[PDB]
């Protein structure tokens, strides 16, 4: 859980 990193992919 962040906002800077990509959750998917």
């Amino acid at each position, epitope marked *: *859980h*962040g906002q800077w*990193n990509k959750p998917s992919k």
Partner: antibody
Amino acid sequence: VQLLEQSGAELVKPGASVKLSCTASGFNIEDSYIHWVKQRPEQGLEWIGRIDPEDGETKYAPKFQGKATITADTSSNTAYLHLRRLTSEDTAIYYCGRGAYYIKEDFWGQGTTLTVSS
Amino acid sequence: LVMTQTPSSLSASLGERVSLTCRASQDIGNNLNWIQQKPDGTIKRLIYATSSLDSGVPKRFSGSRSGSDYSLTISSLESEDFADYYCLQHDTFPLTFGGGTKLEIKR
């Protein structure tokens, strides 16, 4: 072998527009979130916005939303930051930082010094 | 949301232990990184997810929360540690950086 190489420093006239670049190397750019950070001379870092090159979905900081327009070209493996109606307040160095899936794989670009002058 | 980084400036001897704090204004959880800007302009993130150290960053660098106060700590200060440090929060938009801390070395 993987890095973010930014376009060269440049001068631009006021009222004009510029299109900074950030080419990813050693990995496919859509496998990450690409952020854009600004830094006015003798000042602190500021977040401009971030792009999901996969679909081009962009999120911005309130103050930059009426001037910035981030985009990308999956094939060219590059992310661009486009600034319109340039002024003296836009003279600063712009950095592109990677927001990879594996958080441990994040790194930044050297920066692109942009001077806005007559 | 306003990250209040303190102190603005800090002069410390070598070997010494320093701590830089950032007071989260509206609670951001575990989403707070620490980046370091060397004199030459280059940027490198030291701490991520509040306490987890990135690759290669030396053992003397640590991160830890304590209420609404997040802090970066250097157990023993070295010459190569001279730089500017900023705390980044990536919880709510717009993402925020602290005012930064200019770390000078007593010699």
